[PDB]
Ligand SMILES: Nc1ncnc2c1ncn2[C@@H]1O[C@H](COP(=O)(O)OP(=O)(O)O)[C@@H](O)[C@H]1O
């Protein structure tokens with residue numbers, strides 16, 4: 001006794017965005033049951049080896065994954081990927097990050113024709129650069145309904161300004177399971193090293209000013225610096241929305257540095273939202289975002305989950321091969337490595353499981369939506385007061401893109417890590 005989204009309904013949705021796995025459409029119809037919501041639809045994914053089993057079938061979970069995630073029977077009982085991701089978020093991630101900042105969503109039934117319609121729609125509405133990317137999987141019979149976190153409330157009460165950050169990893173591993181030649185990993189961030197490789201593959205116009213160790217520092221000055229740095233070189237780490245509409249960033253990691261032209265337009269798109277004179281809104285806005293980030297302490301709870309990566313991939317990869325019952329292709333072995341192989345099967349499972357949960361935390365994004373208060377409105381939830389403009393802003397913070405990482409990807413994490421540290425070493 002609910003509903004199926006049909007071909008008729010497809011006209012009510014408009015393209016908002018996409019990542020590697022999902023398309024996101026925002027609601028544009030009149031029904032109050034959907035105003036201020038988005039729909040998340042899974043892409044058809046080939047050629048992804050990590051999601052196939054021994055026979056090349058894209059099963060919900062492989063036998064190895066079922067064994068690894070055994071402690072939640074509800075998670076392994078999922079009939080499809082939509083149910084799997086929702087139960088992962090609800091049962092594994094929400095206990096860790098809290099229900100306040102995480103929205104598991106509501107599953108909705110969709111017909112093939114609805115999805116075939118959305119397929120054609122995204123083809124027309126996508127930026128030209130994304131036209132050959134993977135479209136909607138039309139064999140799935142479900143999609144996900146979520147609150148649009150680019151909106152504070154379903155409607156407008158000034159405007160809503162929404163800031164989306166992909167913060168990446170905010171800590172450095174210990175030397176405990178890192179080889180002597182790779183020791184720079186304990187002093188230079190993964191993000192900073194990755195920037196060098198990305199620059200070499202000319203995937204970016206220049207090195208990002210952003211340093212995730214600033215964002216997660218616990219220092220209010222350093223948090224501000226991180227925000228300022230993200231404004232200057234957004235790449236794919238920083239976006240700003242005006243009532244759900246892009247006003248900064250959004251062109252992938254290839255997004256250009258904020259030029260005077262983009263800077264000028266941004267300052268004006270802030271008119272009315274920040275009650276400050278022309279040219280001054282941008283500084284006050286960055287201060288606003290910095291204050292909300294720091295004041296919420298939402299990043300402290302995210303850092304702890306990232307810190308579930310105890311051994312680093314260099315250490316963790318050994319536990320992985322013990323799980324899948326294969327001789328280790330990595331082990332001139334170290335004494336630290338051999339002790340890990342001596343660990344009980346149960347603690348070896350725990351380590352890898354915690355590594356994968358950590359990856360979710362390292363690869364997710366935060367959305368901070370803002371609403372300008374009136375002086376005739378009563379006392380506020382969570383808020384930030386900008387003293388120089390005498391303005392109070394209500395804010396909400398939500399974690400998005402909290403996906404379950406497949407077990408076989410451990411191999412990819414190692415390959416990539418090996419490549420990043422190798423390159424960064426010989427560049428010194
Ligand atoms: N609940 C939401 N509210 C508003 N915008 C969203 C929401 N979820 C996703 N988006 C937008 O869609 C984009 C891609 O969504 P995401 O779920 O991260 O895709 P993927 O899972 O493929 O990475 C995001 O960068 C964000 O701008």
Ligand SMILES: [Zn+2]
Nearest residue numbers: 318328330331
């Ligand atoms: Zn080994």
